[PDB]
Design a protein around this ligand. Structure first.
Ligand SMILES: OC[C@H]1O[C@@](CO)(O[C@H]2O[C@H](CO)[C@@H](O)[C@H](O)[C@H]2O)[C@@H](O)[C@@H]1O
Ligand SMILES: OC[C@H]1O[C@@](CO)(O[C@H]2O[C@H](CO)[C@@H](O)[C@H](O)[C@H]2O)[C@@H](O)[C@@H]1O
Ligand SMILES: [Mg+2]
Length: 580
DNA sequence: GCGATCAGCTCG
DNA sequence: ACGAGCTGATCGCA
């Protein structure tokens, strides 16, 4: 049965009530400078559909949109807010965002449209976006009649579902998590995305030319050593050259052919000179394809800026993700790849890049939640945690810790945070399970608090059906009760890791909110540009650096109060590369 | 022809 | 190992 609504030709007072469900549709996946195809409004007076060229040109409508006292309920308000920013229109007053509400209730559901969220509450009087717009090449905006009804039904669903969603969030003690954390953060991410990051395309193009020279030299050297030419980027072709023509040892398989992962080649290097050249070839190839050509494809020709999109409702732990481009995985470990960062520059003359990062936030959060005396004392003394762990596990003095001992203690620390398992550690340290198990046993002997927490959190997950973070984020773990060892073990590791990684996410998100409030009170021009899990990157006039050196770390350190201090390191410079 | 999966890489 | 995204090659078949 069709849904009644007014297809309006002009904006009326009735459409400007102080509370309504609002839909500002942007069909393009990437909403930057993208079209708004239609608008729907549902309030106490009825349901309305408005053509964008009409509503967005109306003084009364635009004023209503920017009036903070006129409340709106929406789905993915950030998408609309940014699309409107590109048009010079401000969106205010969003008091409820169905996408974020659904995400907090159950991130595993993968809710990416109104229909998926509505299904959670047995509401199905609305179609999934894919069914209306289609997918891939077939995707397209339907004719007005079909478009208008879809938008109205989405607005109607949002109007009906607000109370049910707020009620459950309240029962979960997540009401403040949505209203005081996620929704305000949404607006901040919108500003960051809209601002974008300036790219030195000339620099990138010159690096690309040099990589082309290097790749060509290594490419030939590879054919020379193999005695023939082949597609190096083909795991299958490569597999034949290595394990058949050259007779190299087969230490591990995959599926279709042989395994040629970097880990496998690292072990084969001793046998043949072609191996080292293949590893180098792959390193350069990744930089060229992904960080040179890939980046250049998404830079705006007119402004020379890249405008990422932060997915705020995807990860199972509460972390953010980044796309088109992904600015959370720019090279830094290897020097050659790290040079890529010299291409990210300030958006204005005489401005600089400022980067601040939490030091060991995950292990600090663990010390807090586990209340391990030895680990809390370690951070209270601000000790090098990997050296300290080596001292305890191997029973030696600080002076007796060798480079290899610290390396292995470091690996034990990662396993503990990720969810420790002898197989996982053994695989990572290239040692036997028995040995890895010994390392773990030794660790728990030195940190009995962490051991009790790991045992207790797994038990809690089984009793409650989920685990939670510091700010009450939730993750359900149904596989925790599986009678299949591999499936159950994975869920146990998630029970152990989620409260750590998740609480660290909670903290940096609150820090972003606190920081923006501080920047505004101080009327600083500085503004956030990116967030990379445990680090915040800003840009500002060179004249604001000294003030930021004090303000940013403090805000980030005081975001929450834990049983151990929080530590933040910071750097600034002419490019992102220099902010170290 | 197109889209989906595998295999590889980058980051925290 | 925990949590993500992007690219080149290839297995898919409409
Ligand atoms: O707008 C981001 C928001 O939209 C979802 C779907 O509701 O993802 C869409 O947009 C992303 C950014 O362009 C794409 O990566 C994704 O493929 C597309 O479906 C949500 O997941 C996200 O929170
Ligand atoms: O041996 C107990 C020890 O095993 C773990 C797995 O590392 O959990 C197993 O035993 C529990 C009973 O004590 C079960 O609830 C759980 O399902 C099973 O995998 C640890 O959590 C526990 O300390
Ligand atoms: Mg750090």
């Amino acid at each position: 049965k069709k849904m009644a609504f007014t297809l309006a030709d002009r904006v009326t007072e009735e459409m400007l009530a102080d509370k309504a469900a609002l839909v500002v549709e942007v069909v393009e996946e990437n909403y930057h400078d993208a079209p708004i195809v239609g608008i729907a409004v549902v309030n106490e007076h009825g349901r309305f559909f408005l053509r964008p060229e009409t509503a967005l040109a109306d003084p009364q409508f635009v004023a209503w949109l920017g009036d903070e006292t006129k409340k709106k309920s929406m789905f993915d308000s950030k998408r609309a807010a940014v699309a409107l920013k590109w048009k010079g229109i401000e969106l205010c007053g969003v008091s409820f965002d169905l996408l974020l509400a659904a995400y907090l209730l159950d991130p595993a559901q993968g809710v990416d449209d109104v229909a998926a969220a509505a299904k959670m509450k047995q509401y199905e009087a609305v179609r999934p976006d894919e069914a209306v717009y289609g997918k891939g090449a077939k995707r397209a905006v339907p004719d007005e009649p079909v478009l208008a009804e879809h938008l109205v039904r989405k607005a109607a669903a949002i109007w009906e579902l607000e109370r049910p969603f707020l009620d459950e969030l309240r029962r979960n003690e997540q009401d403040r998590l949505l209203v005081e954390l996620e929704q305000p953060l949404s607006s901040i991410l919108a500003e960051m995305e809209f601002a974008g990051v300036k790219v030195d395309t000339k620099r990138l193009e010159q690096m690309g030319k040099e990589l082309a020279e290097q790749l060509g030299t290594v490419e030939q050297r590879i054919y020379e050593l193999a005695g023939q030419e082949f597609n190096i980027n083909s795991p299958k072709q490569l597999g034949v050259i290595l394990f058949e023509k050259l007779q190299l040892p087969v230490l591990k398989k995959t599926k279709t052919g042989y395994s040629t992962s970097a880990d496998v080649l690292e072990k084969l290097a001793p046998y043949h000179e072609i191996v080292e050249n293949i590893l180098h070839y792959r390193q350069l190839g990744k930089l060229q394809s992904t960080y040179i050509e890939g980046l250049l494809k998404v830079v705006r020709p007119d402004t020379k800026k890249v405008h990422t999109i932060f997915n705020q409702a995807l990860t199972q732990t509460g972390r953010l993700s980044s796309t088109e481009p992904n600015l959370q995985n720019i090279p830094i470990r290897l020097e050659e790849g790290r040079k890529i960062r010299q291409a990210f520059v300030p958006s204005e003359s005489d401005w600089l890049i400022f980067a601040a990062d939490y030091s060991q936030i995950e292990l600090r959060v663990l010390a807090h939640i586990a209340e391990d005396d030895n680990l809390m004392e370690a951070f209270r003394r601000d000790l090098d945690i990997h050296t300290k762990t080596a001292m305890d596990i191997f029973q030696v003095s600080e002076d007796e810790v060798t480079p290899n001992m610290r390396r292995q203690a470091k690996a034990v620390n990662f396993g503990i945070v990720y969810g420790i398992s002898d197989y996982g550690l053994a695989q990572n340290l290239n040692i036997s399970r028995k040995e890895a198990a010994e390392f773990i046993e030794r660790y728990f002997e030195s940190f009995p608090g962490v051991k009790r927490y790991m045992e207790n959190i797994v038990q809690e997950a089984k009793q409650k059906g989920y685990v939670t973070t510091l700010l009450h984020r939730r993750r359900y773990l149904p596989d925790i009760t599986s009678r299949n060892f591999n499936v159950r073990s994975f869920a146990e590791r998630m029970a152990m890791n989620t409260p750590i990684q998740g609480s660290a996410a909670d903290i940096i998100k609150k820090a972003m909110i606190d920081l923006n409030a501080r920047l505004k009170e101080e009327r600083l021009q500085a503004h956030l540009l990116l967030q990379v899990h445990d680090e915040l990157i800003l840009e500002a006039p060179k004249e604001e650096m000294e003030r930021l050196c004090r303000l940013v770390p403090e805000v980030m350190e005081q975001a929450v109060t834990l049983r151990v201090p929080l530590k933040v390191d910071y750097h600034y410079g002419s490019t992102w590369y220099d902010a170290k």
